[PDB]
Amino acid sequence: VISYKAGDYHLVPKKFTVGKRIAVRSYLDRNRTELSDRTFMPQKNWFRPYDLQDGCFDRDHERLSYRFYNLETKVIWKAFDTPELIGMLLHDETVKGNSGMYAPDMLDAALHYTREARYWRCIGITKPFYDRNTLRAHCWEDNGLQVGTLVMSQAMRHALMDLERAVRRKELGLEPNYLWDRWGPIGFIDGARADYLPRFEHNPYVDPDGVDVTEIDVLPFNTHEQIRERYRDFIEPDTAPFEEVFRSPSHGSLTTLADIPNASVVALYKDLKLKAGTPVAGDAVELAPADVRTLFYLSANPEWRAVADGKASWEEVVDAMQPVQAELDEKIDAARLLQNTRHNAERVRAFFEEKCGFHDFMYTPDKTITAAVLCYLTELRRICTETAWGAALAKCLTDMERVQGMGRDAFLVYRHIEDAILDKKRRLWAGRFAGESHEESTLDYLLENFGR
Amino acid sequence: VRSPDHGYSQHILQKDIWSPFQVGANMMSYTPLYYDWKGFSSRDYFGHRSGTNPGSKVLLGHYRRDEVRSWGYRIMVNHKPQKRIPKWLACVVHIPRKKTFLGFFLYANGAYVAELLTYKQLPRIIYNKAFQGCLPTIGQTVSLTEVTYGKEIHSVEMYPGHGGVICRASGTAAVVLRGSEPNLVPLLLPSKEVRLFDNMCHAVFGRRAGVMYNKQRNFSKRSVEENMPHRPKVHSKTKRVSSHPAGGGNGGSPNLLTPLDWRIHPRNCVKTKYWLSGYILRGRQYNRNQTVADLKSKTYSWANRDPVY
Amino acid sequence: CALCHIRFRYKQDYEAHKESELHVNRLRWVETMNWWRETGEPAYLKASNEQWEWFEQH
Amino acid sequence: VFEEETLRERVLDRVVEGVFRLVPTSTDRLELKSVANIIDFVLTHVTVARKPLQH
RNA sequence: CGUUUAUUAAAUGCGUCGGUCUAAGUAUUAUAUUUAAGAUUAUUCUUGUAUAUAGAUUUUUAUUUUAAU
C-alpha cells in the first residue's frame, strides 16, 4: 500500500506558495537593504574559460592573423597607454593559453614600439592606431600617397612647438624646461592644472624669456626624419642610469631586522659583526647594502645552509664562502622579476619602486618611466633569449610547474623572500587594526582625553 | 571635544546640528558611492501627481518635490556591516538632507565603504573588535543572540541576512525585551510595537547617532528649508468647493466633521495596517497608551500575540 | 475569543460570553466535528465497508 | 571580501594556485575577491576540463 | 520677507501637536492634516461623525474630529 495522510503534496514546492496558491513577488516586496552589500562585496561574475584557440585555428593564416590583429595590437596599445603593464598582458595572454607570448619575437616588437611609441607620444599622437590595419604615425600628408610627410594634426603642431621651444632654450644656453617632462601618470607632477594641447589662441603658453615659436616654425618639420634628429635629445629616453638594476638583488621593502628566522641568522650577522675587522653591531634597523641582505635569504631558508656555514667563525667566510649560491641569485632574481611585475596593476608599480628608485611611481615623469620599462623589457629579452631556463620559467604560472624546471632549491629560496615581503605588508595592514580601546566607558572618557 | 553633537545655532532660531569631527564637504562626495536619479516628484504612472492608491506601501507622497537635487551630496549607505572584522572610522560625514550621520569605515579588509555611525563613536578608532565580553562594544555589529535584555541596538535587520531596516534614524534604538520564544528575540521598536525578531539577525550595538535631532533642529530660513523641499500643503478648507468638500463658506469655516485628504484621513480612523507579519506581536495601536517602561517589563511569547486583530 | 473572532470591549460581557449564544453554539459545532472524526467517521466508513464486502461475497 | 592585496595573494597562491593548481589572469583577479567568486572561477575552469563526453 | 486674476491678517513656509505607518525606504522617520513662528499662557462641558464593539443596525465618547446657545 502507499500511505497518504492528505495535506501532503501542495503541487507547488512549499517555498513558492502560500498555504495553497503560488505567491507573487514583484521587486516591491523586496527591500533595497539587501543589494546594499554591493558597496564592498562585488556582484557575481562570469569568468570566461581560458582557451588556446587552436580548435578555432584549423589552418595557418587565421592563427597568424590574430597574432597581430589581436595579440600584437594589444601590445602597440599597451606600449602606448601604460608601458609598465606591458608585462602584465604578456602574462594575461599566456595564462589564456597562447603560445608565443614570451617568444623572442613578441618581445623584440614590444620593446620596439615601447622604444618608439615614446617619440610619437611626445609628437602629439593620442591614438597609436589609425584604423584596424595601420598606425597613425604613418598617415602621409596626401590621401595616402605622400612619401613621408606626416599628417600633423593641430595637437601635434602644438606638441612640436613645445619641443621646439625646449630646443631654442638650450640653444640660447638656458635650461630647457620641457613642458612634458613634468608630465607623469597623474598629469603634471607639480600638482598644476594640466595644459591641454590644442591650446586656445587666448591662452598661448608664455615664457618670460622671449622665446618665439609659432606655426611658421614647425610646418617644415613635417616628416618623421627631421624631428628624430632635431628633437633627438628630448623624444629619446635615457637608458644609462637604469642599465643594470633588474639584474641585481634589491628588496625595497625588506629591512635588515626582517628575516624568516627573525633572530637566529641575524644573531649570526651580529656575531660576525663584532668579532670582525671593521666590526659594527646592529641596533640601527637601517637597511644594510642590498647584496649582503639577499645573502641571508640564501642562508636562512635552507636549514642546510643555515648550519652549513653557521659553523664558520669568521666574517667574510660566511659572507664569501657562499658564492656558489651567489651563482644562484640570478635564477631567483629572474623569478622575483617576473612574479613581481606580473599579476596586478599594483604589484608592478610597487615593484619599480624598489629597483629603479621611483619614490612614488605616480609622480615620476614619463621620460623617467618609459626608460625603466625599456630597461626592463631589455632584460626580459635577456632572460627569454640568452639562457635556456628563461623560456620555461616565463611560461610557468603555478609553483608546482615552476619548481620543476629551474632550481628546486632555488625556489625554496625566494618563496621565503616573497613570503617575507608580503609578511612585511602584514605588519602594515594588521598594524592598523590591532589597537583596541573601545568600550561603553572608555569611549566616553576618550572625549575629554581628546579635549586636551 | 565638547559634546560630539552641537546645536550650532547660526541664527537664534536656526539651529542646525553641526558635529565637531564632521568631515568638510570636500571629503564627502566619493565616486563609486554616489548615486543620482530624478525622483519622480509625486508623479506616478501617467505623470498625474498623486499619492498612493489606498492599499499599497509604495510612497509617492502627493506633497513631494526636489527629492534628488542634482549637485547635492548623495553618497550611498551600506546597511549591511560585516560581523566581526575590525572597522576603522576614517571620518564622520554629515549630510543635511538625509539627516543621518555616516562615517567611512575601512573594515580591515580593504572596503572603504560602511556608513551608519552609532552614537558616541570617535573617528580614527577600531570598532568591530570585541572586548573581554561577548560583543558588548559600541559600534560592534552583534547578532541578536549576543545581546542581553535591556541594552539598545540600532539598524536591526528585519529578516536575517537581508540588511538592516529597523532603527536607522538618528538617535534611535530598538530595545531588547527578553522574550520566552525558543529561537526568537522580541525587540521594542521605537514605535512602541514589539516584534519577534529572529535571534540570528544582525544588529549594530548602541544608539544610532546624532542625538539632538528629536528637537533642536529648526531651520526658519527660506534658503535653509532646502534640506526638506516639499510642495506647498494648502489648506483643505480653501479649495474651490467644486474641488474639495471643505471649501468656501464666507469666512473661516472650521472644517467638515470627517476630515479627508481627498478620499478620507479621519483623524484616528484611516489606520492603514492591512497585512500583519507573522513576527508582529503587538502593533503600535496595542501599546500606544500604556508607557515605554511597562512594555519592557513582561516576557513576550506567542501567547502574548493577540489571536484577533 | 479566537474561537469566534470576538474582541470584547465591555467587561461584564467578557464574563457572560462563555454561555453566550455565540460561544455555546460555536462550542457545539467545533465539537460535533470532533465527534465525527473521533468516533463517527472511522466507524461510518467502517460499516460502509462491512456491507459492500458482504455484498460482493454473499 | 578578499580585497587588500595582502589577503588576496594569501588566498590565491594557496587555494586557486595551490590546492587546485589553477592560475587566474590579471583582469579576473580583480573581481576574484570573494568566497562567492572564488568558487565560481574554479567551477568554470574545472567544468571546461572534463573531456567532452565521447559518444 | 516668499506668493497670488479684481492683491490682502488671501494662500505658502520653520517649530510644536494630532493621527497613520515596522513585508518598500530611516516611527527622534516619512506619509495626512489642523494651526501658525518669538514670548506668556493655553480654562469649563458634552447629545452627534470617528474609534473600539459582541450577526448590524440601535446602543457606546481614553486620545482625535466637531461642538459649548
User: CA dist B297 to A450, B150, B181, B287, B294, Å?
Assistant: 39, 10, 16, 13, 5
Q: Which of B238, B233, B268, B299 is nearest to B62 (CA)?
A: B233
Inter-chain touch B125–A447, beta carbons under 8 Å = no
Of A92, A345, A429, the CB nearest to D4: A429
**Which amino acid is present at C39?**
T
Neighbours of C (≥3 Cβ pairs closer than 8 A)?
Answer: B
User: Within an 8 Å CB–CB cutoff, is residue D7 touching chain B?
Assistant: yes
Q: How many Å is the Cα radius of gyration of chain C?
A: 20
Write b or e for each residue in B293-302: b if 16 or more Cβ atoms lie within 10 A of its Cβ, otherwise e.
eebeeeebee
Q: Between B and C, how many CB-CB pairs are < 8 A?
A: 6
Cβ-Cβ contacts under 8 Å, B122 against chain A:
443, 446-447, 450
Q: Which residue has the cell 525587540?
A: B187
Beta bridge partners of B194: B188, B282
User: CA dist B20 to A234, A265, B123, B156, B211, Å?
Assistant: 52, 51, 11, 27, 14
Instruction: Indicate the DSSP class of residue A37.
Output: G
**Phi, psi values for residue B6, rounded to 5°:** -120, 145
Four-CA torsion A150, A156, A160, A166, nearest 10 degrees: -150
Q: Report the residue of D1, D4, D5 to disrupt the A interface, i.e. the one with the largest count of A CBs within 10 Å.
A: D5
Taking a contact as any Cβ pair under 8 Å apart, which residues of chain A between 71 and 90 contact chain D?
A: 88-89
| Cα gap A420→A426, rounded to integer Å | 10
Nearest residue by alpha-carbon distance to C1' of E52: C9
- Resolution of the coordinates, Å: 3.6
The DSSP code sequence of A146-206 is SSSBB---TTHHHHHHHHHHHHHHHHTTS----GGGSEEBTEETTSPPP--SS--TTS---
Helix (H) / strand (E) element for A362: namely none
Give residues with Cβ within 8 angstroms of A386, minimum separation 6. Answer: none
Inter-chain touch B162–A34, beta carbons under 8 Å = yes
B149 CA from E64 C1′ (Å): 35
A93 exposed, middle or buried (CB, 10 Å; 0-12, 13-18, 19+)? buried
Angle between helices A366-381 and A345-355 (to 10 degrees): 90
Structure method = cryo-EM
Taking a contact as any Cβ pair under 8 Å apart, which residues of chain A between 412 and 431 contact chain B?
A: 429
Cβ-Cβ contacts under 8 Å, C17 against chain B:
none
Inter-chain touch D26–A96, beta carbons under 8 Å = no
User: CA dist B114 to B80, B81, B128, B210, B211, Å?
Assistant: 8, 7, 12, 17, 20
B228 CA from E12 C1′ (Å): 15
Report the largest interatomic distance among the alpha carbons of chain B, rounded to a whole angstrom.
73
Q: Residue A101 has which C-alpha cell? A: 607570448
The DSSP code sequence of A381-442 is HIIIIISTHHHHHHH--SHHHHHHHS-HHHHHHHTTTHHHHHHHHHHHHHHHTT-----SSH
Cβ-Cβ contacts under 8 Å, D33 against chain B:
none
User: Within an 8 Å CB–CB cutoff, is residue A154 touching chain D?
Assistant: no
**Phi, psi values for residue B185, rounded to 5°:** -125, 125
| Cα gap D39→D11, rounded to integer Å | 12
- Whether the CB-CB separation of A374 and A239 falls below 8 Å is answered with yes
Q: Please give, rounded to a whole number of angstroms, the shortest distance from the CA of D45 to a CA of chain A.
A: 6
Write b or e for each residue in B60-77: b if 16 or more Cβ atoms lie within 10 A of its Cβ, otherwise e.
bebebeeeeeeeebbbbb
Q: Residue A361 has which C-alpha cell? A: 611611481
Cβ-Cβ contacts under 8 Å, D4 against chain B:
109-110
| Cα gap B129→A437, rounded to integer Å | 9
| Cα gap A38→A45, rounded to integer Å | 13
Residues shown for chain B: 309
| Cα gap A236→B191, rounded to integer Å | 73
Q: Please give, rounded to a whole number of angstroms, the shortest distance from the CA of A185 to a CA of chain D.
A: 20
Instruction: Indicate the DSSP class of residue A2.
Output: -
Of D13, D29, D31, the CB nearest to A42: D31
B251 CA from E4 C1′ (Å): 19
Within 10 angstroms of residue A98's Cβ, the number of other Cβ atoms is 22
The DSSP code sequence of chain B is ---SSEE--SSSS-B-EE-TTBPPGGGT--GGGB------TTB-SSS-B----SS------SS---SS-SSS--B-------SSS---EEEEEE-SSS--EEEEE-TTTT-----B--TT--SS---SS--SSSS-STT-EEETTS--TT-EEESEESSTTS-EEES-STT--EEE-----SSEEEEE-TTS-EEEEETT-EEEES--S--S-SSS-B--STTGGGGS-------SSSSTTTT-SS---SS-----SS--SSS---TTT--------SSEEE-HHHHTTS-SSHHHHS---GGGS-S--
Residues shown for chain A: 452
Instruction: Indicate the DSSP class of residue A313.
Output: -
Cβ-Cβ contacts under 8 Å, D2 against chain B:
109
Q: Which of B305, B308, B286, B304 is nearest to C4 (CA)?
A: B308
Angle between helices A106-119 and A88-95 (to 10 degrees): 150
B282 CA from E51 C1′ (Å): 18
| Cα gap B234→B186, rounded to integer Å | 42
Bridging pattern class, strands B152-154 and B174-176: antiparallel
Q: Three-class SS of residue A237? A: coil
Nearest residue by alpha-carbon distance to C1' of E53: C9
Chain C residue with the nearest C-alpha to that of B305: C2
Strand nucleotide closest to residue C6 (CA to C1'): E54
Q: Helical H runs in A253-302? A: 264-271, 290-297
Nearest residue by alpha-carbon distance to C1' of E37: B220
| Cα gap A14→B224, rounded to integer Å | 53
Report CA torsion sign: B48, B54, B59, B64: positive
Chains B and A touch, contact meaning at least 3 pairs of CB atoms under 8 angstroms apart: yes
End-to-end CA distance of chain C: 54
Write b or e for each residue in A256-276: b if 16 or more Cβ atoms lie within 10 A of its Cβ, otherwise e.
bbbbbbeeebbebbbebbeee
A381 exposed, middle or buried (CB, 10 Å; 0-12, 13-18, 19+)? middle
- Whether the CB-CB separation of A351 and A341 falls below 8 Å is answered with yes
- Whether the CB-CB separation of B135 and A439 falls below 8 Å is answered with no
Q: Which of A95, A104, A52, A93 is nearest to A70 (CA)?
A: A93
Q: Which long-range contacts (CB under 8 A, 24 or more apart) does A353-362 make?
A: A353/A252, A354/A250, A354/A251, A354/A252, A354/A253, A355/A245, A355/A246, A355/A248, A355/A250, A355/A252, A356/A242, A356/A245, A357/A245, A361/A84, A361/A185, A362/A184, A362/A185, A362/A186
Given its phi and psi angles, is residue A12 left (phi above 0), alpha (psi -120 to 50 degrees) or beta? beta
User: Within an 8 Å CB–CB cutoff, is residue A425 touching chain D?
Assistant: yes
Q: How many Å is the Cα radius of gyration of chain A?
A: 30
Four-CA torsion A261, A265, A266, A272, nearest 10 degrees: 180
| Cα gap A419→A259, rounded to integer Å | 10
The DSSP code sequence of A429-449 is HHHHTT-----SSHHHHHHHH
Q: Residue A122 has which C-alpha cell? A: 611626445
Instruction: Indicate the DSSP class of residue A43.
Output: P
Chains B and D touch, contact meaning at least 3 pairs of CB atoms under 8 angstroms apart: yes
**Cα B177 versus chain centre, distance:** 20
Beta bridge partners of B15: B218
Strand nucleotide closest to residue B209 (CA to C1'): E28
Q: Please give, rounded to a whole number of angstroms, the shortest distance from the CA of A101 to a CA of chain B.
A: 33
Cβ-Cβ contacts under 8 Å, B109 against chain D:
1-4, 7
Bridging pattern class, strands B156-157 and B164-166: antiparallel
Within 10 angstroms of residue A198's Cβ, the number of other Cβ atoms is 12
Q: Please give, rounded to a whole number of angstroms, the shortest distance from the CA of A79 to a CA of chain B.
A: 29
